[PDB]
């Protein structure tokens, strides 16, 4: 009856522009796990379960993104507040010939499955036992309601709540506002001058696309889960180019530009980049996205790895008053065509949480999944006061293999290192592989 439909509409708020992409991608491939995110947390001591679930608890109740429920409307897919029910596997694993590999074997059965947008709770949190004190908290998300950044915010919450359960302390108030908040003001920014400026800010700076650069050897739909090669490097290998994640951001898309300019030829580089670098216990709400803007880089004669890092600065600058407006809609208004791209190449510097703890026993994160690679995406893991990053080369399965990646990932690597060296030498003059 049209009362049941009127509530549908007047409880909810619509999806977001990125959200709409997603669910538009899940409706065309139901059954596809490709928008699963997904981390483990290993922590080097005891975990008590009952316990943990509490925390569990009170962060669900904090970080109310993971209790949005999304419904089905004549005017596409609606969200609100909803009331999942939930539970905590735990696994003893340590009387398995393999233990870690089992975990990882239980861990991947999970975030190998797609889940129906419409049937919450849309997150898993499960208590994996590895040996005597070793646990792995597995922690699975779908990205319509989370990122890497928020699932980073959501780990060390509840690191800090299970230490106060432990200890018989009650946690301080936490510092993240409510997702209704986020969609409340998204709500007003559609409607909004500012949204209208933004809009022909980045239409006239998009001006004269074309395919983007890539060392794809094709483009294509994501269709399956990322392929992936993982580096670490010491900080110290990167010089004094990088001390904090601005700075670290500004060099890995300089050098990532110049490495596209070499192997294409494209002078005019576009790469997607957050025109702001988050970080943790900063007020974040858990669930709200940074949203990726084409960053362009200009290559021409003698261009080197300082003046790429002065242009990252003032794109990023000259972006800042328009980062409200999403990349989804701008892609659309420049009328280009069926499944193309402002951008092949993403780059996405993430923090390293020096401090986690849980119980007093140390802890650290290790992504899984981190949401589909349309084409190929770098994922950089790295804080001030840690020596080493962490990079993952995600990428398309249809657009590359893993010998083709791999070869890519060394070359560049050795790249960036080149040209933390020698921040005055030209692009051009760099050896390759």
């Given amino acids: 009856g049209s009362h049941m439909d009127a509530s549908v509409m007047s409880t909810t708020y619509a999806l977001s522009a990125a959200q709409t992409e997603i669910w538009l991608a899940q409706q065309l491939y139901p059954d596809s796990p490709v928008y699963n995110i997904a981390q483990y947390t290993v922590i080097e001591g005891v975990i008590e379960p009952a316990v943990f679930e509490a925390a569990l608890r009170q962060v669900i109740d904090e970080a109310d993104t993971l209790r949005l429920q999304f419904i089905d409307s004549d005017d596409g897919l609606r969200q609100r507040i909803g009331t999942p029910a939930w ?58 309601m989370m990122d890497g950044y928020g699932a980073y915010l959501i780990a060390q919450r509840v690191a800090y709540v299970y230490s106060a359960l432990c200890e018989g302390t009650t946690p301080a108030e936490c510092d993240f506002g409510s997702i209704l908040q ?76 110049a490495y596209l300019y070499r192997f294409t030829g494209e002078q005019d580089v576009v790469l997607g980049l957050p025109v702001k670098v988050r970080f943790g216990a900063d007020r974040h709400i858990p669930g709200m996205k940074s949203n990726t803007l084409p960053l362009r880089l200009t290559m021409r004669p003698g261009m080197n790895l300082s003046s790429l890092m002065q242009q990252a600065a003032q794109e990023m600058q000259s972006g800042l008053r328009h980062q409200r407006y999403p990349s989804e809609a701008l892609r659309r208004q420049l009328g280009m065509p069926s499944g193309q791209r402002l951008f092949g190449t993403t780059v996405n510097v993430m923090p390293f949480d020096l401090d986690l703890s849980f119980g007093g ?3 650290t994160n290790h992504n899984l999944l981190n949401g589909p690679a349309e084409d190929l995406m770098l994922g950089v893991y790295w804080t001030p006061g840690s020596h080493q990053l962490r990079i993952d080369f995600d990428a398309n399965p249809a657009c590359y293999t893993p010998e083709g990646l791999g070869a890519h990932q060394r070359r560049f690597i050795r790249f960036m290192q080149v040209l933390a060296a020698d921040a005055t030498q030209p692009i051009d003059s760099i050896d390759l592989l």
């Avoid at 947008?117 to 036992?129: D, E, I, V, W």
């Avoid at 709500?187 to 004269?208: F, G, P, T, V």
């Avoid at 004094?240 to 670290?248: E, G, K, V, Y």
Wanted: proline share 6%.
């Fill in 87 to 144: 539970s905590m596997p735990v696994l003893d694993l340590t009387a398995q010939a393999d233990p870690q590999a089992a975990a990882q074997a239980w861990m991947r059965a999970d975030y190998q499955q797609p889940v129906n947008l419409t049937q919450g709770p849309l997150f898993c949190y499960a208590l994996l036992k590895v040996a005597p004190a070793q646990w792995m908290w597995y922690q699975r998300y779908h990205v319509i």
């Fill in 182 to 257: 986020l969609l409340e003001s998204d709500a007003q920014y559609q409607i909004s001058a500012q949204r209208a400026q933004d809009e022909a800010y980045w239409l006239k700076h998009c001006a004269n696309w074309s395919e983007p650069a890539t060392l794809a050897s094709r483009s294509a739909p994501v269709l399956q889960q990322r392929l992936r090669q993982t580096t670490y490097l010491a900080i110290q290998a990167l010089g004094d180019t990088a001390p904090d994640a601005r700075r670290l951001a500004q060099f890995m898309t300089a050098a990532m530009a």
């Fill in 361 to 363: 026993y140390s802890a």
